[PDB]
């Protein structure tokens, strides 16, 4: 929905409905957002504000960017 009402975001990649391209937002009610549009947003907000990261969130910048660079989009048919 909007991130005024967003608390947890799950990125399960093996035992979910379909795979990495689905990621469930929730707050309780849950949603079914887009996979490569939440991962490709959190890369773009940690890499943008790279002057304030505590040293633990740089591991989030490296995990999300590796997990996004391995998804073959041409096999999403």
């Amino acid at each position, epitope marked *: 929905l909007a991130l005024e009402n967003i608390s947890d975001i799950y990125l399960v*990649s093996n035992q979910t409905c379909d*795979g*990495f391209s689905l990621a469930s937002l929730n707050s309780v009610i849950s949603r079914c957002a887009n996979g490569l549009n939440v991962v490709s947003f959190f890369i773009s907000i940690l*890499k943008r504000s*790279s002057s304030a990261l505590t*040293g633990h969130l*740089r*591991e989030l*910048l*490296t*995990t999300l*960017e*590796t*997990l996004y*660079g*391995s*998804f*073959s*989009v041409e*096999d999403l048919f």
Partner: antibody
Amino acid sequence: QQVKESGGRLVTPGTPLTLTCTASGFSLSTYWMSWVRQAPGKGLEYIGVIGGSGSTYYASWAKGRFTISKTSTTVDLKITSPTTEDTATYFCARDSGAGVRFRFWGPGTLVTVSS
Amino acid sequence: DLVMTQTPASVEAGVGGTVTINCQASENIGSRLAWYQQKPGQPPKLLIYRASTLESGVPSRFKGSGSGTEFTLTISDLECADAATYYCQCTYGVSITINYGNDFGGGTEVVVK
């Protein structure tokens, strides 16, 4: 699930050689294939990596000389100019998306380069 | 790229002992490491990934520890089938922002007697 690489032969030093690596039994396609080297009796040496999106990276010494390029089902290495010190055994290491657990390793094809 | 000074070159113990391997990354790679185990004439088998998480299939003996710039493996109660070469790999090598390379270690034989 398993990984096999294939194609390595004796070459005249200076004839370009390509090795192929076939992923046989995987279900999801989020992979980071990687090639490593081992000269006979030495430690392992890292060569490069290729993603699913095509994002290729190389090591510091193996820049310019090697080229990793994927296809629909294979991952191809290309040695541009095999010199005499490029004789080794070449492995293929595939994993899941996180890029940290290089779990499946092929048996190895033994490239030898000498006229 | 960074270097991995894997010390020592060859360790030695007996059955029921414990060994230690050290390797020191040149930059703060931050608990992204992996330990392999290559027997003579085999492809390397993964043991520990992310420097403390056992690969599903290894015995409970292998352990790994450390973060920042210094890491260690401590095989314990060395069985007879432990004479192999042990490498440590820095798996910080697939990104565009940091990308600290992916070089292996120097090599350590673990021979029993």
